[PDB]
Every structure is written in C-alpha cells, then in structure tokens.
Ligand binder design. Sequence first.
Ligand code: ZN
Ligand code: ZN
Ligand code: ZN
Ligand code: ZN
Ligand code: ZN
Ligand code: ZN
Ligand code: ZN
Ligand code: ZN
Lengths: 457, 457, 457, 457
Amino acid sequence: MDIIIKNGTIVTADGISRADLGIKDGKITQIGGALGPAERTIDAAGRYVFPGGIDVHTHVETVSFNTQSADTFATATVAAACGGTTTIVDFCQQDRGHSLAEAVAKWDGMAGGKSAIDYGYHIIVLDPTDSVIEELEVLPDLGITSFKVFMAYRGMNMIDDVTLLKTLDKAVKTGSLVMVHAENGDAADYLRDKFVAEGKTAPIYHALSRPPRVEAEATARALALAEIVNAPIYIVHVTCEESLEEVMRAKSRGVRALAETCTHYLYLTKEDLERPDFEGAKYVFTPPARAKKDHDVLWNALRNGVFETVSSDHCSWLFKGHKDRGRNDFRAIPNGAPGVEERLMMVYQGVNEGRISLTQFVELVATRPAKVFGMFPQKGTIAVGSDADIVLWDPEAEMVIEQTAMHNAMDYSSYEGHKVKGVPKTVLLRGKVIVDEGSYVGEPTDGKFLKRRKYKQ
Amino acid sequence: MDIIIKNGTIVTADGISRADLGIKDGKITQIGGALGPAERTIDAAGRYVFPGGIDVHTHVETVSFNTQSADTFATATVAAACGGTTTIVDFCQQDRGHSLAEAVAKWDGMAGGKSAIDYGYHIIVLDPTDSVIEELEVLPDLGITSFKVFMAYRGMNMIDDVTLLKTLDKAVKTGSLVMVHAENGDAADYLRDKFVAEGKTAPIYHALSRPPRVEAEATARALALAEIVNAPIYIVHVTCEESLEEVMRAKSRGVRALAETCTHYLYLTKEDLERPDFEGAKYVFTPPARAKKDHDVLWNALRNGVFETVSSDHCSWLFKGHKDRGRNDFRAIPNGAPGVEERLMMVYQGVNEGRISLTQFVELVATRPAKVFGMFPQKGTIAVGSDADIVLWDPEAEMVIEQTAMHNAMDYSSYEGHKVKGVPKTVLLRGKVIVDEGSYVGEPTDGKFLKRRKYKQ
Amino acid sequence: MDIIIKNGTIVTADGISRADLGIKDGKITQIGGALGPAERTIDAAGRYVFPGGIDVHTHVETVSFNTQSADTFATATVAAACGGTTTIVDFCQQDRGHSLAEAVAKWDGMAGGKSAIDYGYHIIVLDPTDSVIEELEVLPDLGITSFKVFMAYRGMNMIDDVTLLKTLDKAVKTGSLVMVHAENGDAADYLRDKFVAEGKTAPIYHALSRPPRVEAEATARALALAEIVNAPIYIVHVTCEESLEEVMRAKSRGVRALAETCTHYLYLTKEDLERPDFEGAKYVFTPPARAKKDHDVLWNALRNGVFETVSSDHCSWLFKGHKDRGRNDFRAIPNGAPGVEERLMMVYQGVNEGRISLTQFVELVATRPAKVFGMFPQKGTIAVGSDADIVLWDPEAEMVIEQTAMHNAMDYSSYEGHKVKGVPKTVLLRGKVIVDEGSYVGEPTDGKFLKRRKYKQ
Amino acid sequence: MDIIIKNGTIVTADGISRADLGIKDGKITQIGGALGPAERTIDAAGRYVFPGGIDVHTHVETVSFNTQSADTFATATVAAACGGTTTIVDFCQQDRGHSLAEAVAKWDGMAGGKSAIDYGYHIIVLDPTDSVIEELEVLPDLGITSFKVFMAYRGMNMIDDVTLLKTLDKAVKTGSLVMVHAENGDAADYLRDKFVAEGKTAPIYHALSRPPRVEAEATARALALAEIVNAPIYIVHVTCEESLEEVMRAKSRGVRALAETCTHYLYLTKEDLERPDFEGAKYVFTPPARAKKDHDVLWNALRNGVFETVSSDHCSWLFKGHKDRGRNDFRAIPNGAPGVEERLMMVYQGVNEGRISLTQFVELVATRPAKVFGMFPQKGTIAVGSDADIVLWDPEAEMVIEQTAMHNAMDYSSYEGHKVKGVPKTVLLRGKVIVDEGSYVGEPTDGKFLKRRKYKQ
Ligand SMILES: [Zn+2]
Ligand SMILES: [Zn+2]
Ligand SMILES: [Zn+2]
Ligand SMILES: [Zn+2]
Ligand SMILES: [Zn+2]
Ligand SMILES: [Zn+2]
Ligand SMILES: [Zn+2]
Ligand SMILES: [Zn+2]
C-alpha cells in the first residue's frame, strides 16, 4: 500500500462515508476494512476526501494578436493543482492555414513534460479546409473526441453555419461532441463599432456591445443546427437567463443539447466593468458579465441539474502587460479572465449557502464533466479502480482570496477580496502527493495526456 | 466478514469499478484490497452490483370503498425484493374523522413484523382538521417528513387550496416536503359525468374524462401555491408534456419544485384502455395513460436529469375481483395498477436502448430518491457505511415478464408479455440474502421502519 | 336633417376622412356630399369626429358592506358623457339568496330614467343556486348575454371551479360569454392574514398580499376550464406580464380566450400605494397596481391587438368617507378606484406618444368592445345606420386633470395632476347633444337600456 | 355623380351598413342620403360592397435562371382584378452588379401602361454594395418604403447578418420597413444535398430538406437583429407553429415585429408534394407546405389579430414548361405557386366556416395591409375620400375553382377543384368598372404606380 488516507469523510457525487482509503500504484485499491502497512499515511481527520477537480474549459497557454498569455501550461497546471483540480481539458487551437495534427503536435510541445496535472485536448477548428474537416475523422482515435467552433470573433475564430453543419456531421460519424461559443459575431461587431463611432470606449461597452440577445440567438441557432444534423452539441459558458432558455427549449424538443457555466458567471456582473481606473478591464471576458438575476437563474439551474459542469474558461492577460492595450478602446482589450485555481473554492461556497448540495458540488466540479468528456470512471470519482486523483478539503478553513497567495503567473485574481470557507489542503495525482498542506510539491513532469473516449452526450 | 461479493462490477450513480465487497453487520465495511475470511462468499462474476432499489411511491396495502387491495404489506414487499427493491416509502393514509397518529399506528400494525424489506412512511392528509394540521408539527420527529395531499377525488381524498397552503406552511416550519397528486378534480368530474350521461361507459373514457389539461392546470396551481408560501413541493407522477412543462416553468421562476414519473408512464398509452374484452380495465390508473410522444418527452427529461426518480405508484386491484365492478361504468373501476416488482427491470431497459445511461439508472432507481426523502447515505448507494442493501444484476439475462412468474398477490401484470434484458438475481437487505438466484429466501420479519430525515428539496 | 357636423375629420377604427355628417332621428344618415338644411349645425373644424366611447367594465352604483358608493347611476353616467363615453355596460350584481331577475329588476330601478347615456348589463352570479344557474337560460333573451363570476373575495363574491364550469356550460348553450375576475382568493387570504398577523397594515400590503402569481394562476385555471368546457371566456382586467402570458398561452392552444386591461394598469404602480399620509389608499384597487415594466408589456400587447378593449372598472369609494375604514388595516379598505370619465383622454395619450395609433384608439376605446359584447354596428363606429353617438375631440387642447373639474360625485381622481393633450369637447347621444363645449346639457332621462346580442367571442 | 352603387351592404373592417354609394372622379364622395343622377348605376342587391383587395406580396413578372415566368405584369394584374384585388405591391428585384434605380426603371418598363390595376413596389436588395445600400436613402422619397432581403437561396438572393443589420439601420434612418424571407439557407443546403446524395429526388424532399426548424431559426435571428438595431421588421410568409412562436416571443419582448401568411399555408400540406405523377411539383413553393395542425395555428392567429394580412406570394412557373426541369431533381424545380386571383375567395371561405369574421376578412384582405404599407386611407376601405376601388361580392354564389376559368397565363391552379361559396362579381378601380359580372372589361393602361408612405410598423 503506497498511501493510506484515514479519518476522512469520502464525499463522492453519490455517497458520503467515513472510511479509510488504500492507494496502490496510482489507483484506489481498497476502501474500508483492514488496510495494513503503507509507505505514507495521511490524516484526513475533520476533512473531506473529494475526487480531484476536473476543468474541461481552459486556455492554459495562448497567443492572441502576436502577444502571448501570462500563464503557460506549466504555471497554470500548478495553480490548478493548488486549487484542487487534477485534470484539465485545454482547447488545442488550430492556426489558420495549418492542419489539426500540426496543432496537436504544437500542443504536445507545450504540455509534454511540463504539466503538473493530467490533461486532455479539445480541438478548435477555425480554418474549415476540406482536408482539415477530413482530419476530424482521425483525431478521435488519438483521444481527441470533442470539436470546438466559434460563432463570433470575425476574422479570427468565427466560422459559419455551413462549417458548423459540416462539423456536426463529422462528429456524428466519428462519435464526437461538438462544442460551440454561441454569440452572433456580426450583431456584436455592429454594436461594437457603433459605440466606438459615438466615442464610447470604456470597458463597459464591451458588455453593452454584446447583450444577452447576441448570446441567445447564436445559442438557439447552434441548437437548431444540431437538431437538423440530429447530433449532440455542447454549449460552452451559458451566461444568462435568455440563452439558458434556448438550451432548455432545445432539450424539450428532444435535441441532445448539453451546456455548462463558468465560475465568474455566478459571481460577477457587468457593473464590475465600471470599476474605476480601468479596473473594469480585468472583467472583460466573453460573453460579458451579466446581472445578479442571472446568478440566481444559473444557480437554480445548477441545483436542478441542468448543467454538465461549472468550468473556468481560464485565460491569462496581465492587467498591466495585456489589458493595457485598450485603455482607449475596449475593443483592443484582450478578452478573458483567470480562475483555474479558484474554481473549486468558489463553486464550493454554493454548498455553504444552500445554493447547491455537498454531493452536487462533486458532481459538477468533477464527476459529471468526466462522464461527458469520456474520462469516467478512470477520472471523476473515488471508487476502486479510480486513478488516485484526490483533494483533501477542510470545510472549516476560512480565507480571503488574494492574488499574492495564488500560484499562477497573473498579476490579479477575478475573485480578489472574496472571503471563502472551505479550502483545498493537500492534493494527489494518481497516487502522488503534489500539494501538501498548501505547498506545491510536485514535478512539471507528473502530468500526462489523456486519450479521452468517444460518443459524448 | 459476514459476506463477501467478488468478481462483480460495482455500479453506483457516480462510479463503475470492478472490485470486491466486504459486508459486516448489515453494512458495507470494505471495498477492494484484501478482504479475508467470510461466512459466505457470493460470486458476482459477469454481474453488476447495484445499490438496492428504492421505491418512494407505493400503496402496498389499501382499502378503497369497503373493499381491500389484493396485496398486503407482506405480499408486496416480497415482490419488491424479488424485483431488486430493498426500501419502500408507502403512503400512510389518514381515515376521515381520525388523527394522523391513529393512521401511523394503523400502518405500523400492517408493516411491523410483516415487511420483507425496509420501509418508511409518507403521510396523506385528507381531513385537514385544525388538530390534524397541528399534528404535522409532530410527525416529522417520528421520521415522517413528507406530507401528501390530493387535488382530485371529490369526497374521498380531495382537499382545497386553503388546505394545501396550510400544509405547505406547516411543512416549511417543520422542514418537511409536501407531495401532491395534481389533477383538477372538478374538471374531471364534469367530464366524467358528461360522458356517462351520453352513455359512454367503456374504460377509454377514464382517460378522456381527465385529459392532459386536467393534470397541467392542477400542477401549475400547486406549484404557484408553493411559490406563494415559498416552500419546496414534490409533484408525484408527472405523466405528460403539458404538465411537465408547468414543472419546468416553475423551476425557472426559482420555485423549489421537484417531480417524478412512474414506470407505466414510459410504456403505456391511452390506447391500452381500448384493449378488447374489458382488458383495458387493467390500465385504468391515474392520471390516465398518455401517448407515445409523452414517452419520448419523459425519457428525454430523465436523460436531462429533470426528475428525482421513477417510482411505481403500486396498487393491487384484482382484474377479476376488483376491476370488475366497472364493466358497465368506468367510474366504478378502482384506479391503480401493479408494478413494484417490475420497476427496476422496466427502467433498466432504458439503458439498453440508450434512452438513459447505466449510471443514471442507479441515480433514478435508488440514489436520487434516497437523497430527496432523507435516507442518504444510509440507503441509496454502495459505499463504506451504507446498509448492505444490494442487487446483483445479470445484464445479459433475457426473460419475458409473466404474472405467473411474479411474486405478489395480483392476477395480472401491467407489463405482461414484455421481453426484457437484465434481471435481478440475488438481493441483500442490510447484509442478509433475501433473494437467492431468483428465489425469495427471507423472513417477513426482516423489514424495518425507517425514521427519515427532514428538510427535503 | 336634425344635425350636421361639418369641417371635421371622421376617425373610425378603419378610416380617416375629412367629410361632413348628416344626423336624422338619432342616426347617421349621410356622410359627404350635399347635406342640405339642418335644425342645428356643429363646426368640428380642427377636431376629430370619433365614435362615442364604450366602457364595458363599470360599477356605476354599488353597495359594499352595508355602505353605498359615492356615485350613482346618474352621477356616473354624467361623468361618462363629459368624458366622451356614450355607452356603458354595468355589472348587475346578484344578492345572496335572491334571483338574477330580482337583480335585473333592482338594476332597472337604479338606471331607468336616470342614466345620462345608454347602458347594458353584465350579470354577476355570486350565489350559484340550481335555480339561479337555470336562469342563465333566460337572461340572454332579455339582452343580458354575458355572465360574470369571481375567483377571489371569500364569502362575498367567490365561487368555485364547479360553479365556473356550470356557468361556462350554460353560456355555451345560451350563446353567452363568461367573464371572470381571475385571482386565487385563498392564496390572497393566506398572504393578507399573514401580513396582518405580522403587524403589517399599510396600504402597500394590499398589493404585496396579492402578487402577480395570484392573478396568473387564477387566469390560467379559468382559461383551462374554458378549454375543458370548450367555451369562449373573457378575462377582465389583465394587469401584468405573468397573467397576460397565460392568456397568450391559452390563445395558442386554440382556446377562444379574450382579455382586456384598464386605464390605471397603464399608468399606476404599486409604489403609488406608498404615497404618504394614507394617500396610497386611493390606489387600493384589484388586482393590485403593478410595475412600469408591466405598462410596457400591456401597451405593446395593445399595439399588437391582443386586448379587446381598455375599460375602466370604475368604482366610487370616497377617500374620506369610505377609504377611511382602513387607516389601520388595508384589508378593510374598500377596493376600487374611479375613472369612467378619464378613460378616453388617458388612453388617447397613448396615441400622442406613439404607443398606439390614432385608429387603434377608436378600436380599443369603442369599436372592438361593441363588437365583442353584441352592440355592433348599432354602437361602436361612425357609419350610415349607426346611432349618432359621437365625440368631437380637440387633439390640440391641453389640460391638467383635476377632480375639481371632473363631473361625478367622488372626492378625488386617480389621475389627479396628469397633463393631457386631446380633450372631449361636445358629445352626442343618438343625435342629441348632451355635452356642449364642455358643459353637460342633457337629461337623466336620455339614457336607454340596450338589449345586447348573443354569441360573444 | 359618375357612378352609384345601390341596394348593397357596405362591409368595411369596422362597419356593416346597408346604404348606397356615390362615386365621383375616381373617389367615393357620398354614402347614404339623396344621391341624385348618375352616368351609371349598379345594383348591388343581395351583395356585399367590399373595399378592393390589396395583395402586398406578389412576383407578377420574374426571370429565374435565364427563364421567364409564365405571367407578366399584364396577365397577372388582369387575374388580380377578376379576383377582387385592385392594388398590388410587387417585389422589384435588383440584378447582381446593378443599382436599385436600374431595377426600379426596369420595373416601370414592365408595369407602366400594362397594369390592369394599381401597384406599388417593394425593393429587393440582393447585392448589398456600399453604393446600393446608400441608395436606400433615396428610394423612400420615390415612394418605395419597404426593403426586402433573403436569408436563404445561396448565390442567388441570400445576404448575411451584416447586410440585414445594415439594411435594418438604413430603414430606421429613412423611416422604412425591412421585410425578410426567413429560412436558414445553409441548413437547407445541407439537407438538400444530403438527400440528393442518398438518391432522394422526388418533390417531397423539397419540404423535408427545409423543415420548420429551418424557418423558425431564421425567423428568430431576423427578429433578434431587428431588436438589436431597434427597428421594425416584417416577416413574410410565416408558415408554421414553430416560426410563428418566434414572432410571438419577439412581440412580447417589445420588438416591433410584424408578420403575415399566405393563402396556401392555410390550405395545403406537405403531403400535397406526394401527389402522383409529378403533380406534387405544382406545390413546390417556399417555405414548404406544412401540416393541418399548422392550418389551425395560423387561422387561430388570424382570428386573434396576430398577422397583418394574408398575401399570396404569387408566382408563375408552368407545370409543363418550368416545373418540368426537376422531374429528376427537386432542387431544379423553380420554387413558387400561383394565387393572386384566388386569394380573396379562398380567405373568404374562412368567414363561411367561422374561422374568421366577415369584418376581419376585409381587415386582412385589404385594410390592414394598406395601413402597414402606407396606402391608407387612399386605399384600403370604403369611406368618403377613398379611391373608388371596390368589389361587389355575391356571398351565395357557389363555384368550383378551375384553371380553365381563371384569368392569368398559368397552366394550373393551386386550388384546382376547391368548391367555394362567395365570388367576386364586378370590380371598380378608382371609379372605373374593370370587371363586370365576371368579365374583364378594363384596359392595361388603367393601373397606376403608387408612391407609398414612409414609417411602416
Ligand atoms: Zn468562449
Ligand atoms: Zn473559452
Ligand atoms: Zn396519485
Ligand atoms: Zn399514488
Ligand atoms: Zn374585478
Ligand atoms: Zn370590476
Ligand atoms: Zn419568399
Ligand atoms: Zn416571395
């Protein structure tokens, strides 16, 4: 027995039991009973033993407009671990004019031997060449079973209905799942330019230039297209009442529509973009921050089991280095905010306030995502046979989130100042302790790529 | 170690692992690892090890219009066990003019020392006396934390909005959950009488006399009342697209609305009431059987995680002895159909047809119900600390459901003739084997009452 | 030619033409062309020639809780005339324990020889006796073709679904139209009492004790019942987004559902009940005043042609004499507000603000109501054969509405202080000038009863 | 007095009166009273005197894929007159690479001195050049105040959201109304090609290749874009429950959304495309024929006043000459069906079956369209000052619609075989009798262009 975790309360999505764990060769081999001798023994007394967090929506390392993101695959995964997240599914981005394979290879270069935690890939298709699209017949067998496309971001990521339909079609044939950023780009452009023309350049206009309708329409269209092709689809970052409604309408018609939300959409509002002295720039992410009523809508949807997970959509644009190129034009502000580390703690506060149950926390934060994106049961819960990806949670620990205490390469936190109750203490990745009582103690060589399974839905 | 289950695949709502189990003193004490010696060892090779079924909607023993139901607490619980269900929550029915306590005592008389499996009680309030309503302040502490009322059945079970509001109010104060049969009784009566007046007396008119609108309206009203009192509510047997829609609308408004469906609403249709030679009488249950499009609607809702469970609403009215008093007036036909035994197999067929996942099967059939009605984690899953309520499922076993092979006191099955794949083989109740390879081998003294926990939602 | 109206612009719901009118024997006999000599000639230069207003929702003379209303059939009809309204359909109220006929006779006593303008009756059924209900087979032939019931006001007006269904059924047989006040009375009572118990007695609680859900639910139920009986139904005073939504859903299902709104629901808000020094008592009407967003919803619905009319629901409870019995308990405040006189001017302001068209003003204010309640084309528009019920409107006239300038017996106006553009100047009732340049010059003997036509929808 | 119409019943949208008419110099100068001498007198005894029909959706003369339509501006307008329609608003189609002016001039060439009845133009923008779009600032002042764009028909008519937004924007500035053919072209193409690839080429696939969702999505998107620009929009040919629903949702949000339907969408179904021997080709129009349930939905919507009119979308593709190029590929079948002549009779049958009222018939068939497209009150009703555009209707006349009896250049009728009650007998265009007791007796020089008014909504 390599490791034994005793005196803790094992909390899975469908179980709560005070028992001891036996880890052997990166896997959980025994729960309860006589465990025997063990190299190391961890005392989880007064703590929860949760499955490791699984963030299926990250942009760990990116290059936007010749400039690079503050975080790298190494700096982000370390923060992820310190935040209780042991698996991540980053968005492998294709380069215009290049192949998907060229993209995967590029990603391997960034991840290989540098990820503190395990990782899988989603493939972004932003240059739908006949050959590129034909590659979707190949990537699945490499363990990349989810294709992602954008309906916004003209001349950068945006593709059209013809493309989406072709992607939906290839996904059905290869048993893959299409993911989509649903915003009507043209509608946004129209408003963005109209605002700038009127001399309106503050961060707030990032939100006003792309109101709920922009998201709602695109969402509905994508779902409609999925219905036509008769394919499963996954709507990333559903952020407001109107777009959620379309997802709901699609589900009732029988469309295999799936959706998710992201931490910040349960806590931030467009008013945050009005914080003085360009601080609002920090909250310039897409879709735009909504309103508090949307927070209730989303939390209720969570409690009712509507969403598949609460991911982070983690980005790293230095407030100083990157957000800066926009102090005079919100359009130039690189979109995105950090949160891969804070995800669990923030979502967990919902169990503290009765918004969501303790058991649902695990479902949303790890088990359900794992199921959808083909990593269950190897990843996701805590059962015999599971990789020993574990988080020892202290439900009573109180703390204020400060970027100075975070573990990535950013110059600010989206949750700076938030008081939380319930903190990740020590983390295990396939049996190895990578975070011990708050200190990262792993190797950038620990993380491994995950060939994810097909037929998602 | 009293018992060891080896070579099986443990399937909980959030886990799938090939491991062995160790049962000691009615509880699961160890999973995986070195188990040691054991009184008995069961070979679950090639079989699933599921948590025991939990049916929160049964009418095991009833007396309707001076006549008694074919099944008793003893005959039903035995059938339940043979069907893979180890816990049941029967509806303890108050008698007009009598107290709730008088009712519970009466139920204990029927269950005590006679239940093959464990059981809890829901309390039906059909005579809202000032004192009776004041009793709702007491029952909770006895372990009866769910109050049930009827919106239909004039001069028998029907109560009014004033009552429902008082019940919703008492439930909020005692941390209980109000359950409701939602049909507009008056609307039904109007149509029932109108049909009989026109000389229409066949079974089909049972359905036509209470169409979807009758259910939908009542559902909406109940949810509206729950919204006003600001209390959680549970809608029993949601059977069609229109009523489900109201539940959905309520959920979006923020109403803590919960709902469920029942096996037969996923398989039977009003056309079944047209089967020749009074056979349709067998399908006279309430609300009425709907249409196939409603089956898709419900299954989709299940797959999307809308419902809390799929219960049975088990009743026992002999086709000959009881249904008979209605061969000339559908109104005289006692409402209800049997299914406590077939529940799991029938719901399981949904995993066979991709309608629902293997993991969701357990969620719906046992884990989610247990959670809602305060029996989790003692009951519900398979974890260390759980009562050893287990079902060893043979996913390959094929069989035709025939009443001659069922184990209750009825003269017919609602699923007579259905071919199924996946059958319950041996069942354990808190460690004791009560069903061995298909043969009931327990004692009517095995079942125990369960003091269920409060604050349901 | 008794009268000739020249130089005016005739504005009907479907026509705008500068032409002269020829009135002979209470009717419009010629439009345009050579008119010839005439007893009197009116110069409508620079003015609109609108059909006379038709208010199908008035409570001109009432007795609530032993006390009588400030206005009588005489004082109200005079105000109506001065406001441009020439026809009215008052709610003839049955007395508990008495017949409908007894009620009509009582009404005739109040109206006969005392109405300044023409009038018809709606019959309120608040004591559904077998005989009473059987009377609905008679009233229609007397010219009373619309039955009204209440879903709220316990022990005063409230009837049940059984009653409503019986009424809906009688209406279908006699070709009548059922009207309904849709609020869940029990839900309201629950909240009303709960508030008082907590010591909350200010006027505001009149609104909070009966929020939108209370109205919405009842509305839906009534429409559902209408659907079951398969009968046309008319929802009086739809006041908010949620209840309107139910009307809309009913219409889509094919239910012959009709609805209306009332002047004050386009201008007042629940915040008005918070006006200091018990002033809010003036705004205590039912359903409660909503919010501004509901004003937009309603106006949009009007512009889209959803509603059949904008009536007033005119009541007369002296702010001093009557509202007073409630300075310590909002529940004791008699419900209702005045507006029969201000109706047209207030609705007309909507054409000034582009909310509604000039042509729709007439449709809503007179032509559509006349059509629905069987008085078209005798009443309603301006065509050859129409009764000469006319209003000469000055679109440029500006004025502030002050009760001191109104013409009824009330001590306040619901629109006190409102600045308006467009005032009624001279009014004709079947050819007779009853209001001349702002001065009432008619006789309480001018008004006549109207036997209204059947089959409304 | 040039003409006098006596003994008839004048039926306008808001009036029904037995009176005589006096026409002088193309206008109605007097109604009722002493008319005097007249060049000609028409006896409308036992007949209705309706305002002339107004069809705002025609394609009288078209050129699709090098081939020309069977009907010309002359042959169509004659049929229109014989059908009771006196005004038409044809879709002036721009040619790729050419200006809008070039298009108008081309249209004048076709209409000038050749139209049997009056006509206006809608301008189709299918080549959104910077200059072309700038022309929208000019056309309005020429009397062309409605811009039409297509969301389907790739490489032929289809424009994008960027275009639509620019058009919506220009319309708001020039006080014009944007009209749109709402179908997701790409979605359709995907299905069209998929079907052909599978060897499915029969006419039925024209419908299946573009199901309700295709229409619904586009409809919603257009309305969403209109909402963003905050402009009024008009959805042409709403054909089913799902697309109508989007219009309805838009209206509730406050979007100034208008919509219409077309005769054939109230009578034909996709099953018609299955008629044997390529007959189904006759029913190949777009959007595709729906189902009977959609007929009820639409008729109910009509009765509730949802739509602005029931136009025809008149096209002329010879069953033999044109439909033929598709006996082996439904895609090659030119889309469109004839109906400008049958429109009124067909819609009128709805009043016969209680689906719609007699008064609504006129509203939909003439008065409401005239209002929306800025031709009211010159055109639309029957009032003093109106152009004398009249139809003398015989409500008792029965007849079977046969193409051999129609008056255009087509080889078939979409309503061949339909038995109707109520036929147009004699028609007047601005005072001149152009159809006398069923015989066309006008001159192709009678019709004149109409400079329509701005700000439509
Ligand atoms: Zn995104
Ligand atoms: Zn993203
Ligand atoms: Zn029931
Ligand atoms: Zn039941
Ligand atoms: Zn009322
Ligand atoms: Zn009233
Ligand atoms: Zn079209
Ligand atoms: Zn067209």
